[PDB]
Subunit: 231 residues, 2 copies
């Protein structure tokens, strides 16, 4: 089919390594929007962070946050999961690993427990999940540990976001930089990975940009616009 | 001498449509590179302010909920809680079924934000007085904020200064509205962007030639220059 929207990660994709917005990605996004191609920001950060990013950058597509657990579009928030077993898990960690900590953003989240990977390894988290017998998965992005329901991921988030836009998920082109972007790659029509992305993501991408980080995100957007006749 | 710069987000470092202005972005990053922390100030949520700090690249504390929330180094401090605000809202919904609150209310803890598109600020004040609640209602032009009378940008900036380890009088503030007078009062240097109301300009040390984001950039460079950082 045809590509009608571009989904793209925030951190490591439209930013500098320190997470601040990269001017080249900012401009590429604004040009894409002006060409009638909505940009859907995707992130493991909170839905509030994602909304702020959309407002400041100027994106018009729904935002997919909490790694696909939360979606916001036109000021309407929709959460694809709620928390319960995550509290059972954390309480056990609290009692057994007094140095373990969760993200300061937990008050804002509703579809995933975020743990500071520097305070406890994901292996230990998974062991407890198995012990208490919980229907949860723990994923280490290398930056933080996300504990969530098995069905929650960037792919399912993008599929739902696509509904709000009125398009098919296969009409979306995704730009990512990490391993969990494989989930998004699975549901979309075109797949792009920025230069510093893991081998596993690159192998599954239709195109790997020459540049990494923000410049890569900009390159990815231009590649998509050009390949699908928008520019 | 000025050691930090506090600056509003909307109307000061953005375009009228709320998008970040590249010139203000460059100026903020230059100030930071030169060793001058930027403290973002806003009536928006603390989460929005934190996001703005990360995306823009500021290192100073952020002052949100119009002074009711401060965040620094991943530590959030709320200077108020809501109680009477909900009593007020309950009465408002009974009398005016079309009045609505901001979708961001679940994120806030120090101020009720009412959609100005749905009810007049004058009406809100009338109800506050009738119920004899200890609250004030301010119209930012974007939304109506109902908060405790002692919560404001100035008191927020003073607290933020404490966390930064500096004195409020070592801060230079850049504002665009009436509510920035509270900030002007506590800081050491005052700047107003071109579209600011007469009341703010008359009390500013410098009024920029440009409006909005371009004005914010001009303000930052004027400050950096005046205090010998350029």
């Amino acid at each position: 089919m045809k590509i009608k929207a571009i989904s793209i990660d925030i951190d490591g994709t439209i930013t500098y390594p320190n997470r601040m917005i990269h001017e080249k990605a900012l401009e590429a996004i604004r040009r894409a929007e002006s060409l009638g191609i909505p940009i859907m920001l995707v992130t493991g950060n909170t839905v509030q962070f994602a909304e702020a990013a959309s407002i400041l950058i100027g994106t018009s597509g729904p935002v997919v946050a909490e790694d696909g657990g939360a979606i916001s579009y036109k000021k309407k928030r929709i959460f694809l999961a709620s928390m319960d077993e995550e509290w059972i898990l954390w309480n056990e960690i609290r009692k057994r690993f007094p140095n373990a900590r969760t993200s300061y953003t937990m008050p804002d989240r509703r579809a995933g427990l975020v743990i500071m990977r520097e305070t406890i390894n994901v292996e230990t988290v998974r062991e407890i999940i198995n012990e208490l017998n919980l229907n949860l998965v723990a994923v280490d992005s290398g930056f933080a540990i996300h504990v969530k329901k098995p069905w929650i991921n960037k792919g399912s988030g993008i599929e739902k976001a696509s509904e709000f836009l009125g398009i098919k998920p296969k009409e979306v082109a995704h730009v990512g930089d990490g391993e969990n972007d494989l989930d998004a790659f699975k549901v979309v029509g075109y797949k792009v990975a920025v230069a510093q992305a893991p081998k596993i993501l690159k192998e599954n991408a239709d195109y790997v940009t020459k540049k990494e980080y923000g410049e890569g995100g900009a390159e990815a957007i231009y590649h998509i616009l050009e390949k699908f006749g928008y520019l």
